[PDB]
Amino acid sequence: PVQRKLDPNTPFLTGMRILDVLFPVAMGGTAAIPGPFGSGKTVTQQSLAKWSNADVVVYVGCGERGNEMTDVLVEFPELTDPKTGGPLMHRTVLIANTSNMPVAAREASIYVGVTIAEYFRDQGFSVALMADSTSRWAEALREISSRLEEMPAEEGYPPYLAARLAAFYERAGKVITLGGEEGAVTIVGAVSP
Amino acid sequence: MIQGVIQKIAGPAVIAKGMLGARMYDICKVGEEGLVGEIIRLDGDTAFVQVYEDTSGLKVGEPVVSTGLPLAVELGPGMLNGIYDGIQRPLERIREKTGIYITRGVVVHALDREKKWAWTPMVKPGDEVRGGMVLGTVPEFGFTHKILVPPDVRGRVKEVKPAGEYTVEEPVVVLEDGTELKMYHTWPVRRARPVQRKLDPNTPFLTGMRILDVLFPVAMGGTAAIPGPFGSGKTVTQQSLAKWSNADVVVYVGCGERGNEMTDVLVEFPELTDPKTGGPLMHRTVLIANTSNMPVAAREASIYVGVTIAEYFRDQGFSVALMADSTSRWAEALREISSRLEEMPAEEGYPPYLAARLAAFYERAGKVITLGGEEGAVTIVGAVSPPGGDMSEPVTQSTLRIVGAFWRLDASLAFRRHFPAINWNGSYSLFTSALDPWYRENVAEDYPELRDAISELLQREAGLQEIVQLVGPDALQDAERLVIEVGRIIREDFLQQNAYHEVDAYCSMKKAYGIMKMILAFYKEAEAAIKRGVSIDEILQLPVLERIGRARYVSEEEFPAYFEEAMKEIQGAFKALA
Amino acid sequence: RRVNALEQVVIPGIRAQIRFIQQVLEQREREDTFRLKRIKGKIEAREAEEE
Amino acid sequence: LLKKEYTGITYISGPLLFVENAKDLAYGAIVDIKDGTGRVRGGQVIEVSEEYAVIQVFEETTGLDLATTSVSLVEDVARLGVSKEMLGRRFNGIGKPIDGLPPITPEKRLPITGLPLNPVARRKPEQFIQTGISTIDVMNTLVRGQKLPIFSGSGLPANEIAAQIARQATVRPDLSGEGEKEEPFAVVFAAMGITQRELSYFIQEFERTGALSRSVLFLNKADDPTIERILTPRMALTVAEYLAFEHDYHVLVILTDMTNYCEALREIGAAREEIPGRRGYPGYMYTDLATIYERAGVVEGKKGSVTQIPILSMPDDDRTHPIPDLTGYITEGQIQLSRELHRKGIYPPIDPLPSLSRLMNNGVGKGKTREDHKQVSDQLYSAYANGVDIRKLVAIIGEDALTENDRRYLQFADAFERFFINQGQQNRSIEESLQIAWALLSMLPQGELKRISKDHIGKYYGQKLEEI
Ligand SMILES: Nc1ncnc2c1ncn2[C@@H]1O[C@H](COP(=O)(O)OP(=O)(O)OP(=O)(O)O)[C@@H](O)[C@H]1O
Ligand SMILES: Nc1ncnc2c1ncn2[C@@H]1O[C@H](COP(=O)(O)OP(=O)(O)O)[C@@H](O)[C@H]1O
Ligand SMILES: [Mg+2]
Ligand SMILES: [Mg+2]
């Protein structure tokens, strides 16, 4: 719970010219970055994790490769936090669920990440949340609905697929917390058609 | 065997009760009329059978009797000079007892049970026998038919029937354990016959046609596919291969062809003659014939009976060629059978396991050492008819991944009346390099380089087809016109073979080698004579070009004399004209 | 120039669209066959095993 | 240990059979099925309940009946007996010898499904592999621990390229500054859907090279049962993981055709009546492929490594088909063969534009191979992406638009396609491949080479063409 939701009025500085200039996203907004394989989604999300002005960064590896998450564990302690001067990994929380790990756990990771991001929002920080791929979460929903022998929607997905995505993206926004301070959550989610 | 009664009739599906003990995929006899059926289900005391024939008129309570065996064929003497349907029923003997229609429920035997055969034993009591051995010989037309112990039988012999005339039903050899061996044995059509060892392809399959033997060869034991749009010339090419190849036994499979074309091939074949011996051609061939109105289960089993018969004639040591008419209709029958069983189609309407069946059919071809110690080979040639013209049709796509040779035909070359209509820019073969050691050690040492020169010259002429499309061929350069005329000569006097023509339908290897040698010599000498700079336009009308075309129709026995004549004419023309 | 442009640009562009539409329609038919199977199975169960 | 048999078969249809009183069968267990004739078949429990258990049969169900069929449990988890003596041997798709030699003596029995690696336990791939092909080694280099599939069409020499890579690939330790020392290199070769003409070619090439003494072959013919096609690559990966992470080997794994694996997967799923996917393939294909490709990599504190090079054939130039698409989302790059380069005679026909290596930046640079590798790769790539567009525009308009420097640049592009990409059956080292690239680089002025620094120009520029 919160008190109020406010209109975003400050930019979310990502450090990339085309995204910061042509297509800005505000502190508390949402964004989606679709594309085929080998396009540049993961590198963009990792650059946002390195160079953004958010205080706390939560990274959710829903159903992707393991080397892409090992790179984060190796490289990040050797870098520098842009706004505090310490190690970069001291502000970052990782939720990892690779592609060969159990399928039903993909649904839990998204909710765990968004719950942690909301928790750090209540303390007055500015949180940036990155989801590696929501299409894997959709595939997990498809498999679970297939086990229940439910009637499918287009392309076999369950008909309540859009409601879950609406309930996930709605958690972002700049709010006034119950304690009186001001926090914000911004969500950038990659889609894999 | 187990006997039961009917408790449900719904279309071609019949549910029987009391059938506890029946096995899957067995052949059952349904009703008082005796219709054949196949069991595909088991549930408690009941089993689901699927009737091949028409079920109209059946009543609940009629008996069902199981034969205890799956679909199988009878292998033995009497299969040559015969015509069979998809499940091995003799069409000639049915017509004798019934008429011009095929009444359902008729019972006939694949092998004539009342014909006497001469028997000559080759074993004595006290011997030990194992599956695949030879025990006895029987004369049959120009062949000698060998009696084989079935592959699944081993034992010790103490009984020999002496030399005399017996029917195939009479036992000839009785083993110590009570096993009686006859002149025939059964074998399921969907289980491949065992072999000792599978060999590599090292000997060519002599098709008798110049372009197929030289440019796109197939080895003994290989597989080839000949696709193309309708009206291309597949059937005549397959018949020419059946007539003139070096294979000992030919098997022809009709997978559901049109009635009039089946009548055409049924009438034409008895009039043909065997080129090896001069007798009728049907004395060495076995025909499997189906039309479009036959039961759909008989159409699916057509290609398995033929390949099982071909494997049987392989075990005796002969070389077998298996020609199969268009497998697209066989795939259509398979699709219909799958739709009868609700199999959730995957590709277009085809079942997901079409490629597995096609692979299982094509993998039986090969050169092997039989269980008796002899060597035999089986070659499979199949036809495809993609309706869309493009080779992206699912059956063609599945076939392209498991074949070694690919003889694509084109309809446009048929409109120009250039036959055979082989597209040399789309066809390919993967057997050239392996056949190269055989070629140079037997035909000639310079044969592969000469063949590569011919193919290179054909490739060069295809690169000039753009310039001909803008400007006329007369405005082209003298050397370019030279190579264009050489390509035209090569095409019209080397790649042409008319099949309806009486002496244009066959070509040996030595004739082709001599023609290629003459063509290369003429090309090289004319290329030098162009830079010689004398009569450069009159080079195209030299009298040597008559000798080049004359070698197409020269007899093989008269061929060396005309070869010397043409070579010395090339010498006397190019060396001493000017 | 016009011949080369038509040969190299327009025809494969139309052909790809034709292929895409064919695949979509075939996938829709494959989807509805599954629903027909499910409703046939539901018809069989309730009309033969209830009491 | 005592055995148990269940004879309560109640329903047989297609590939499935139902056993009534078998409550003590574990989920996913492996059973053997024996009928009245004594023939033994295989099966797996796919669904178990209180009323009955569902078992699918590995092969055809011909000859089975409800009167004499009995089902006996083999083991609860499908396991493979592995040993160090398997090097030099050949196995079928289920792990039995086919060479006629006596069967091995197992050391351990490992589950073939494996276990997921802990992301904390992995480490970053960093060591370069010299394959001998200039297009691969320079522009799309391969790193120990990578999974880099080869995208091929129908009628292209994928098998010959795979054999050449198997023959020529090794790591040179002296180039890395660590000093020269021998390292144990092994090859695990898995083949499925392979016809006899390809099987003989692979066996003959391996015997002629002499590489059979250090390789293990898993071969599955096209007329074999389709369950062995599913179970073939898992056993090869189980052997490779055991060797690499328990004997410090460096193992290179080649999967000959994944298109046949996907077709066999489609055949199995469609008989179990579940919802299909994009082109009839099952919807869980991504997870099933991920359980195969993700088993490679390196482990912290261990000297071993596993490298995968799958070969798959696209149905067309269709990059959007489900099989190469879902392969692209899991793997770390692709090497794509070009039909245009094959048509004009270039061998091997690797097209640099759709190709990509995602771990190139970690295995190149200062201290590894040579310090000019990345600069040379950038300079070699810098021409093609604009030269191809120039050639496309010329194919419509003509030669009128080209200037003189553009003519030089297109001549360099033609010489590039004729010399660098085309090498035939060569065995180039990385040093001589760099020398050939630099000899091509000396055909352009130093002022136009806008990528390489002038330190590298001052010590490598000016070499004339070497392969003539
Ligand atoms: N900003 C960039 N600068 C340089 N190279 C880049 C950049 N973005 C992407 N690349 C290159 O393209 C590759 C794309 O990798 P990336 O993980 O970003 O792709 P992706 O779209 O997430 O793919 P996938 O769906 O397969 O996970 C990188 O490995 C790198 O080689
Ligand atoms: N070698 C040949 N000589 C003469 N005519 C040929 C030859 N090959 C093909 N044709 C012609 O091609 C046509 C197609 O013949 P056929 O094989 O019966 O039909 P399809 O090609 O559709 O199976 C025939 O009319 C025949 O005249
Ligand atoms: Mg990614
Ligand atoms: Mg025809």
Swiss-Prot record, chain B:
Carries keyword Ion transport?
Answer: yes
Molecular functions (GO terms): ATP binding; proton-transporting ATP synthase activity, rotational mechanism; proton-transporting ATPase activity, rotational mechanism
**Entry GO terms, CC:** proton-transporting ATP synthase complex
**UniProt keyword terms in alphabetical order:** ATP synthesis, ATP-binding, Hydrogen ion transport, Ion transport, Nucleotide-binding, Translocase, Transport
Q: Name one GO biological process term.
A: proton motive force-driven plasma membrane ATP synthesis
- InterPro entries of this UniProt entry? ATP-synt_VA_C, ATP-synth_a_Xtn, ATP_synth_asu-like_sf, ATPase_a/bsu_AS, ATPase_F1/V1/A1_a/bsu_N, ATPase_F1/V1/A1_a/bsu_N_sf, ATPase_F1/V1/A1_a/bsu_nucl-bd, ATPase_F1/V1_b/a_C
Concerning Pfam families, the annotation shows: ATP-synt_ab, ATP-synt_ab_N, ATP-synt_ab_Xtn, ATP-synt_VA_C
Q: What class of enzyme is it?
A: translocase
What chemistry does it catalyse, as a reaction equation?
ATP + H2O + 4 H(+)(in) = ADP + phosphate + 5 H(+)(out)
Positions with a binding annotation for ATP: G228, P229, F230, G231, S232, G233, K234, T235
Q: Which EC numbers characterise this protein's activity in its record? A: 7.1.2.2
| PANTHER family linked to this entry | H(+)-TRANSPORTING TWO-SECTOR ATPASE, V-TYPE PROTON ATPASE CATALYTIC SUBUNIT A
Function recorded in the entry: Produces ATP from ADP in the presence of a proton gradient across the membrane. The V-type alpha chain is a catalytic subunit.
Family that this chain belongs to: Belongs to the ATPase alpha/beta chains family.
Give the protein's recorded name: V-type ATP synthase alpha chain
Species per Swiss-Prot/TrEMBL record: Thermus thermophilus (strain ATCC 27634 / DSM 579 / HB8)
Curated annotation (Swiss-Prot), chain C:
Disulphide bridges: none
Domain of life, per the record?
Bacteria
Q: Which family does it belong to?
A: Belongs to the V-ATPase D subunit family.
**Role summary:** Produces ATP from ADP in the presence of a proton gradient across the membrane.
Q: What is this protein called?
A: V-type ATP synthase subunit D
Source organism per entry reads Thermus thermophilus (strain ATCC 27634 / DSM 579 / HB8)
Q: What is the lineage of its organism?
A: Bacteria, Thermotogati, Deinococcota, Deinococci, Thermales
Name of the gene encoding the protein in the UniProt record: atpD
Which section of the whole protein is represented?
159 to 209 of 223
UniProtKB/Swiss-Prot annotation, chain D:
What GO biological process, any one, is recorded here? proton motive force-driven plasma membrane ATP synthesis
Species whose genome carries this gene: Thermus thermophilus (strain ATCC 27634 / DSM 579 / HB8)
- Which GO MF term does the entry hold, naming one? proton-transporting ATP synthase activity, rotational mechanism
What lineage does UniProt assign to this protein's organism? Bacteria, Thermotogati, Deinococcota, Deinococci, Thermales
Has keyword Cell membrane? no
| Any Pfam family hit | ATP-synt_ab_N
Query: PROSITE patterns attached here?
Result: ATPASE_ALPHA_BETA
Family, per the entry?
A: Belongs to the ATPase alpha/beta chains family.
Instruction: Report the NCBIfam families cross-referenced here.
Output: PRK04196.1
The disulfides recorded in the entry are none
Keyword RNA-binding carried by entry: no
Cross-referenced InterPro entries, in alphabetical order?
A: ATP-synt_VA_C (IPR055190), ATPase_a/bsu_AS (IPR020003), ATPase_F1/V1/A1_a/bsu_N (IPR004100), ATPase_F1/V1/A1_a/bsu_nucl-bd (IPR000194), P-loop_NTPase (IPR027417), V-ATPase_su_B/beta (IPR022879)
* Annotated protein name in UniProt: V-type ATP synthase beta chain
